[PDB]
């Protein structure tokens, strides 16, 4: 299929309670491989997947140097943003940054991203051409002008079109046994009576990888959305994912209902019926 690398950075100011909390996290597709916690003991970038341990000291020394520089810039931004927004020093505020690259089946560059959020909302992102900026508001115009001046787009494009994808590839090779697996869902249905009149059918997908999956109910061969319930795909905690969907049906009518499961692990989509 297609693959991606993503980094996720969060800084949270804590007034009078010291310096900002900073958490950084690295991902290939749906597998976390790297992390930094400003409040952990190591003060180093740390591995979170087996295959990244194949990397030598220069890598760990290069990543730590970088993640610390990212933290330093988020420390400055929390202060700067406060000015741009004319906020007091009493409250807590959040800076978020996300970036990385997507490759298609041929592992070549499809798309790159680089976006910033202040207190829960878009602040500034890089447009899909990776050559200009979209400022979400008037305050972000000040930032956009500074980064246009310092040629940041061009430096980020070089990253997103080359370095990102080169290293994305390398990860995929190095961790082939995990990153390139497919675990097909283990599926089953359950039945629970709400009263004499109604029952809940629940279609389960368990232990699948990657996380992308569809579950859809049908009644007599047609899409059914009314009186259904879908949870967010959740992690199992062993690197696999789980998800379920439910429908409330009239007692005696169960058989009309099918549950349909698409996943990269299912060449042919599964149909489950209670019967």
């Amino acid at each position: 299929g297609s693959h991606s690398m993503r980094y996720f950075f969060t800084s949270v100011s804590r007034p009078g309670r010291g310096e900002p909390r900073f958490i950084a996290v690295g991902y290939v597709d749906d597998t976390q491989f790297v992390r930094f916690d400003s409040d952990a003991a190591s003060q180093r970038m740390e591995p979170r997947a087996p295959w990244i341990e194949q990397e030598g000291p220069e890598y760990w020394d290069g990543e730590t140097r970088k993640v610390k520089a990212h933290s330093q810039t988020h420390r400055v931004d929390l202060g700067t943003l406060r000015g741009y927004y004319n906020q007091s020093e009493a409250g807590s505020h959040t800076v978020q940054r996300m970036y990385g690259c997507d490759v298609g089946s041929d592992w070549r560059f499809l798309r790159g991203y680089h976006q910033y959020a202040y207190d829960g909302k878009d602040y500034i992102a890089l447009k899909e051409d990776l050559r200009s900026w979209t400022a979400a508001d008037m305050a972000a115009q000040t930032t956009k002008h500074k980064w246009e001046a310092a040629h940041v787009a061009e430096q980020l494009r070089a990253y997103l079109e080359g370095t990102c994808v080169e290293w994305l590839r390398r990860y995929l090779e190095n961790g082939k046994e995990t990153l390139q697996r497919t675990d097909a869902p283990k599926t089953h249905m359950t039945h629970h009576a709400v009263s004499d009149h109604e029952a809940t059918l629940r279609c389960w997908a368990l232990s699948f990888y990657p996380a992308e999956i569809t579950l859809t109910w049908q009644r007599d061969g047609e899409d059914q959305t009314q009186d259904t319930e879908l949870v967010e795909t959740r992690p199992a905690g062993d690197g696999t994912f789980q998800k379920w969907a439910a429908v409330v049906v009239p007692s005696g009518q169960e058989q009309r209902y099918t549950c349909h499961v698409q996943h990269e692990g299912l060449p042919k989509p599964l149909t489950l019926r209670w019967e």
Binding site: E63, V76, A150
Partner: peptide, 9 residues
């Protein structure tokens, strides 16, 4: 592999 770019807002 993170980027070198850490420009300030």
């Amino acid at each position: 592999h993170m980027t070198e770019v850490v420009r300030r807002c």
